[PDB]
Amino acid sequence: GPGMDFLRSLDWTQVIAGQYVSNPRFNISDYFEIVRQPGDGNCFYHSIAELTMPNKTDHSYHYIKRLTESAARKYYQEEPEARLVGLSLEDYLKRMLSDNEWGSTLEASMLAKEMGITIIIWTVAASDEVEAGIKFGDGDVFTAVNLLHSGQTHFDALRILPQFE
Amino acid sequence: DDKMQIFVKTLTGKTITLEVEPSDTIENVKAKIQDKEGIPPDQQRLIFAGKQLEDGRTLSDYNIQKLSLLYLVWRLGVPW
Ligand code: NA
């Protein structure tokens, strides 16, 4: 299995090109390992590095931020969520690249394209109960880069638990 | 009166009703979603027929008539 059945039955709605939403109900830790990330403002990029880079350290996220730069130069101008930033490409990059500046669903969308992966952000209440998932890319949960989002600004990395791979 | 009803399916899976005017700006419609659901306008991504709506337009600019279904998602990662 019912776990596998559950994960295989996620109901995704494409709300805009390449962005999908679902609202399964579950305790994130019943299906995923949480890999906790620092609360330093870089957690979005820490989480990505933990799942995409070998021998990840507390400084690996800088590489993700650089991929976010090259992603932005190709995709920022046409990203729907970029409209909410309200900054030119160059001013966005300067802000995005500054120390300890929050990453978000905007960078997730661009990194999905840049890294040729699917990124899912599961947003949870303080109980670690899922309120929604937002998926950038066309892949499924078993191959995606899964991020846990909580407390407005915090991201951790997620790995599917062995019994559900 | 001059008000119509529209539906908004939110990121949390809730299909809410909203009372609006065809002449309301996207900005005004966001403010109403703030009041009913508490999402800050700055954070909202209002979608209709696969397009994200822009703040200086009106519902009527998008041919949004009564009983229309919109999607509301919002940013994750930034303060509120
Ligand atoms: Na199972």
Numbering used by the authors:
A (entry chain A): -2 to 162
B (entry chain B): -2 to 77
The authors write:
Here we applied protein engineering technology to target virus-encoded deubiquitinating enzymes of two viruses with significant impact on human health: Middle East respiratory syndrome coronavirus (MERS-CoV) and Crimean-Congo hemorrhagic fever virus (CCHFV). This resulted in the rapid identification of ubiquitin variant (UbV) inhibitors that bound with high affinity and specificity to the viral deubiquitinating enzymes. Strikingly, coronaviral PLpros also act as vDUBs to suppress host antiviral innate immune responses by targeting cellular Ub-conjugated substrates. The CCHFV vDUB domain is located within the large (L) segment of the genome, and has also been explicitly implicated in the evasion of host Ub- and ISG15-dependent innate immune responses.
Similarly, crystal structures of CCHFV OTU were determined bound to CC.2 or CC.4 to gain insight into how they selectively block the DUB and deISGylating activities of the viral protease. CC.2 and CC.4 were bound in the same orientation as Ub.wt with similar buried surface areas of ~1000 Å2. Interestingly, substitutions in these UbVs were concentrated in the C-terminal region and only substitutions at position 68 and downstream were found to interact with the enzyme. In both UbVs, Tyr68 improves hydrophobic packing with Thr10*, Val12* and Val18* (asterisks denote amino acid numbering of the large segment-encoded protein of CCHFV), relative to His68 in Ub.wt. The conformational freedom of a Gly substitution at position 74 enables the C-terminal tail of each UbV to form numerous favorable interactions with the enzyme. Residues Gly75 and Val75 of CC.2 and CC.4, respectively, occupy space on the CCHFV OTU surface, which in the case of Ub.wt is occupied by the side-chain of Arg74. This alternative conformation permitted by Gly74 in CC.2 and CC.4 allows the side-chain of Trp76 or Trp77 of CC.2 or CC.4, respectively, to pack within different adjacent grooves near the CCHFV OTU active site, with Trp76 of CC.2 forming a cation-π interaction with Arg92*, and the amide nitrogen group of CC.4 residue Trp77 forming a hydrogen bond with the side chain of Gln149*. Differences between the orientations of the C-terminal tails of CC.2 and CC.4 arise from the variation at positions 75 and 76. In CC.4, residue Val75 packs against CCHFV OTU residue Trp99*, and Pro76 appears to restrict conformational freedom and enable hydrophobic interactions with Trp99* and Thr150*. Together with the packing orientation of Trp77, these additional contacts likely account for the high binding affinity of CC.4 for CCHFV OTU. The most potent inhibitors of MERS-CoV PLpro and CCHFV OTU were ME.4 (deubiquitination IC50 = 0.8 nM and deISGlyation IC50 = 1.2 nM) and CC.4 (deubiquitination IC50 = 3.3 nM and deISGlyation IC50 = 11 nM), respectively.
